[PDB]
C-alpha cells in the first residue's frame, strides 16, 4: 500500500495473508467471508505469464494478523487449504477479467477479536455505494512504493472513479467486472495498492446498517500511485452468482 497508514488493531479482522510454504514468503492478500471460506484474486493462484500455478498444498492462509513478518502467537491462526476454485472465465490471457478465486479451508477457523468475516454485497447495497466519489478502504502488506516493505498492515481510503476516467487512463480493455479507484492529480491526496496487495479487499461501510461490505478485490494497476493512473478492482457483486454457486455446491 502506497501513501497509507498503519492499521489499528482489529481494524480489518477479515484480512487474510496468503503464505507460501517453501520458501516461506507472502504471496497475496485475501479476505475471510465465513468460517471456512476465503476470497482472493485469481491471479494470486494462477498466472501463466509468470509461471504461477499454485496447488492447495503449496499454500497456507494466516488470519488475524497485524505484523507482516512476525509469528503472532496466540493471535493469528494458520489454516491449510482443502480446495481452490478459480472463476471458469477468469481471463489471465488479456486483462484479468473476472479476477476472482475462492479457497475452502480444511477446518473452520475460530472467530476472535482479531478474526471476523466481512459481508458480501447484495444488489441494492452495491447500487447505492458503488458511485463515483464514494470512498472505500484497501488494506494489505504489499510494497510501500513502486520502486520498501511495511512492518504492519497498511490501510488507505480511496474514492471510486468515474468509468470514463478509468477507461481513459489506460490502454488495457476494462470490463463491467472491474471498477477503479484513486485520487486524481488535481485532488492533492494520494494512495494506491501495490505489488503484494493483490487479492486483498476493497471495503465500504454501509451507512444504512453500519456493516462492512467487500465491494472489490485488489486486481491490477500500472505502477503504484502514479499521477493519472488508478487501481483496478474486481467487482465482487457482479461475480456473486458464481461465488454463491461454489459455496452452495461445495460448502
Amino acid at each position: 500500500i502506497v501513501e497509507g497508514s498503519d492499521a489499528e488493531i482489529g481494524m480489518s479482522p477479515w484480512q487474510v495473508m496468503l503464505f507460501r510454504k517453501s520458501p516461506q514468503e507472502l504471496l497475496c492478500g485475501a479476505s475471510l467471508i465465513s468460517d471456512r471460506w476465503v476470497l482472493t484474486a485469481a491471479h494470486c493462484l494462477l498466472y501463466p505469464p509468470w509461471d504461477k500455478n499454485f496447488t492447495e498444498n503449496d499454500l497456507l492462509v494466516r488470519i488475524g494478523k497485524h505484523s507482516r513478518t512476525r509469528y503472532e502467537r496466540n493471535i493469528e491462526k494458520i489454516s491449510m487449504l482443502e480446495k481452490i476454485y478459480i472463476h471458469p472465465r477468469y481471463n489471465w490471457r488479456e486483462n484479468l477479467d473476472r479476477d476472482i478465486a475462492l479457497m475452502k479451508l480444511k477446518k473452520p477457523v475460530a472467530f476472535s477479536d482479531y478474526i471476523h468475516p466481512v459481508c458480501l454485497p447484495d444488489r441494492e447495497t452495491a447500487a447505492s455505494l458503488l458511485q463515483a466519489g464514494y470512498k472505500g478502504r484497501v488494506t494489505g502488506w504489499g510494497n510501500l512504493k513502486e520502486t520498501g516493505q511495511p512492518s504492519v498492515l497498511q490501510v488507505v481510503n480511496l474514492p471510486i472513479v468515474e468509468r470514463p476516467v478509468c477507461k481513459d487512463s489506460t490502454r488495457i480493455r476494462i470490463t463491467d467486472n472491474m471498477f477503479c479507484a484513486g485520487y486524481k492529480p488535481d485532488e492533492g491526496k494520494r494512495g494506491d495498492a501495490c505489488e503484494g496487495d493483490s487479492g486483498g479487499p476493497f471495503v465500504m461501510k454501509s451507512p444504512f446498517n453500519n456493516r462492512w461490505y467487500q465491494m472489490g478485490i485488489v486486481s491490477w494497476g500500472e505502477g503504484c500511485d502514479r499521477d493519472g493512473k488508478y487501481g483496478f478492482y474486481t467487482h465482487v457483486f457482479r461475480l456473486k452468482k458464481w461465488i454463491q454457486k461454489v459455496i452452495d455446491q461445495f460448502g
Partner: peptide
C-alpha cells in the same frame, strides 16, 4: 525475512 512458523503447520 519472515519469522519461522510452528512446524505443525508445514506437515
Amino acid at each position: 525475512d519472515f519469522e519461522e512458523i510452528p512446524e505443525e503447520y508445514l506437515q
